Every structure is written in C-alpha cells, then in structure tokens.
Symmetry: C2
Subunit: 232 residues, 2 copies
C-alpha cells in the first residue's frame, strides 16, 4: 500500500492534521492505512475513521443528488444531450468505489466476533450505512442484494445493542435512527420505520433522567421526532 | 488525454455541471480538456477556467497555511516528530503540481500575441497569480526565478491594460490590486506596493461617474483601501 511503510502512530497523527486542514480524502487514506496495520482501533480512532469516510461519501452523495435532480428536470419536455447522465454516472462510480473500500475494511479488519459490544455495534452500524449508501444509487437485482445486506447488518447491530446498551446511549440511538430511515426510505417499509422510531423515542424518554452525561442523545431524539412528523 | 475523445461543447457543459455540484477538481479537468482543443476561449469560458483552478489551488493554499502555522508552533519549545513537516510537504507538492498545470496551459495554449486586449491581459494576469502562488511556498534560487517570472507577467499585463482599458474596468483593477499585493507580500517592495495602489485608487475615483455598469469595480476599490490601511 502507499501507507505500508509509515508507522501506525504517524498515520493517526497525519489523520488528525488532515482533519484540521479539512482534507478528508487524505484523512481517509491515512486512516485506512492505520486500519490495515491489523490492530483494534480505540474509540477515538474509530471516530477518526467514520468522520473521514462520512465526509468523503457525504460530498459525493450530495453531488449525485444535484445531478440526479438536474437529470429529472431535463427528463421533462426539455432539452437533450447525454452529458448530464454521463457525469452523473461518473460520480456514481466514484461513490460506489468509496463504499466498497469502506465495506472491504469493515469485513477484512474491523468486524470481529470479539471486543467491546460498543465497538461491535459501531462497525455493524457502519456496514448498514455504507450498504444503504449503495442502495441509494443501485438498481435491479443488485439493489435487492444490497438492501438485504444493509438489513442483516442493521438487525444484528440491533440485537447486540438492545441487549448490552442503555436506551439513551447515542450509538444505540443513532443506530435505530438510521435503521428506521432505511425502512422508510430504502426498503419501502413505512410501517416498520414508524414503530421502530416510536419504540425508540418512548424507551429513551422513560430514561431521560439517567443521561444527566451528554445531550448528544437529545439531538437524535429530536431527529426521531422530526422524522415521525413526516412519516405520520 | 482523458478528455481527448470528448466533444469540446460537451466538456464546457460538464464544466458547468461540475460547478453546480461543487466539483472543482472535475470542473478543472473538464476545462483543461476544453482548452486543449486548441480554440480561443470566450469571456464566459475563461471565467469557467479561472474559477475552477482558483478553487482547487485555493483549498490547497489554505491547507498549506494551516500546516505551516502548526509547523511554527511545534517549532517553538514543543514537541517533536517529522509528521507535520512531512504532510506540509505532501500538500506543497500537490499545489506546485496544479500551478505547473495552469502555467503550462497558459504558455501552451492561451497566451498569444493576438486577440482582444482584455483576453491578453486576463491570461497574463493569471500567469502572474500562479507564479505568485508558487513564490509563496518556494525557497532559494528557485524562489528568485519565480519572483522574476511573476513580475514580468504582471508588468506586461500593466503595460497592455494602462493603454487599452478605462481606469474603472475591473480586470485592470484586479490586476493592479494583485500586482501591488505581490510587491508588498512577495517581492519585499512596500514602496512600490503603496504607490501602485495609490495611483490606482485615485485614477479610478476620478472616473467613478462613468462606471454607472458594475460595482464589481467598487469592491476592489475597497480592497485597495483596506490594503493601503495596513501598508501605511
């Protein structure tokens, strides 16, 4: 690899520099490099991983949306030229590229039957999310196999978290938020989306007295609310 | 090239899409492709060129600054590790890469003894600016040769513009602003910086009654003011 001859600790340091310079591509390559060393990431390191990929794939999903949308206008009685589909396709391909990279890392290095339950859940949720990102652009039988892959990752995460985390823990909250958005927006399951977000909001309300140590929990709870709004 | 088999008109279109998706790298590759077709750019096309490169080199100069600055803190009684110099060097190399690309295009395709005076000035100013960007990171005799290159491009631009453009024209204004900043910040010539910005502000004030058709002219005039502030 291009990062194979660099010390793990130096890779983490350069990830942190790249974040500060706002170089998410770089930040992401440095973190991939660190992961490939074959050692468990800490909590701080896993966040550095997801923040980096999150931003990279983030810019791509947003450019895709801009382009898909321009490609629907131009699909409504003008006028012509394939350029916009062509470019939309170029961008789609990059995005599939990055998701396969992330899914590769998760499957090759991070997802294990061992470790903390908080980390097991963290990675399985990330698997869920990267499949979901693939599902947003995929078609046909391909789309079908991805949806199932997202579902299995998210479900297994849910089993682990419902058993081993308080209902207020923001990983478990983020996970259930993401899963419910998957049911609604990807899997065509508004019934399942709604009862998940409901169960999840309710069970956390019942405990709001305990989490006083973050109100990172509360932003997600508003998102759950902001969501049950449009879905009902 | 990667753009060699694409139609010129399609390249322009995809530049415009890349701008809207905020993909300046892409936008820049598409415009380089269009330039390589060997045809004069219009006014609209030249702007598409500089907006694209401007943004690419812009993000790099800003990451460089973040890193150079962190590299001075860490150069003041802690602590150690070469990582920050290493990364700063990686980023510097990318930036030199893009400037050489732009200077190549200008020299190979755009700078001509023929055409509009507005275009001749536009490209020579751009040459000035890309050398100046190189000067900001260069050292030693290399730095010396670059400074002279910037100077000659900016000077020749000035000769053309002082003769063939009204004192209020925002290209001539942007050019003199940039040249004066070069004298101050790159060439260690505060005397020359000040008298240029002065002459340039004054001569435009004397004509402010004519430009009523943009007040793009006026923002630059404030910049000239905002500058004569710190320099005196």
């Amino acid at each position: 690899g291009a990062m194979g001859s660099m010390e793990r600790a130096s890779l983490i340091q350069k990830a942190k520099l790249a974040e500060q310079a706002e170089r998410y591509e770089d930040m992401a390559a440095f973190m991939k490099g660190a992961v490939e060393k074959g050692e468990e990431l800490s909590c701080e390191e896993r966040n550095l991983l997801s923040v980096a990929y999150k931003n990279v794939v983030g810019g791509q999903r947003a450019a895709w949306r801009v382009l898909s949308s321009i490609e629907q206008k131009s699909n409504e009685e003008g006028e012509k030229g394939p350029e916009v589909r062509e470019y939309r396709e170029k961008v789609e391909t990059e995005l599939q590229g990055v998701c396969d990279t992330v899914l590769g890392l998760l499957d090759s290095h991070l997802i294990k039957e061992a470790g903390d339950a908080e980390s097991r859940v963290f990675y399985l949720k990330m698997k869920g999310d990267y499949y979901r990102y693939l599902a947003e652009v995929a078609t046909g039988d391909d789309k079908k196999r991805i949806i199932d892959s997202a579902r299995s990752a998210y479900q297994e995460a849910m089993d682990i978290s419902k058993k081993e985390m308080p209902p207020t823990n923001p990983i478990r909250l983020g996970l259930a938020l993401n899963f419910s958005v998957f049911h609604y927006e990807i899997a065509n399951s508004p019934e399942e989306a709604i009862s998940l977000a409901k169960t999840t909001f309710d069970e956390a309300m019942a405990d709001l007295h305990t989490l006083s140590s973050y109100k990172d929990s509360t932003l997600i709870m508003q998102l759950l609310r902001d969501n049950l709004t449009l879905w009902t």
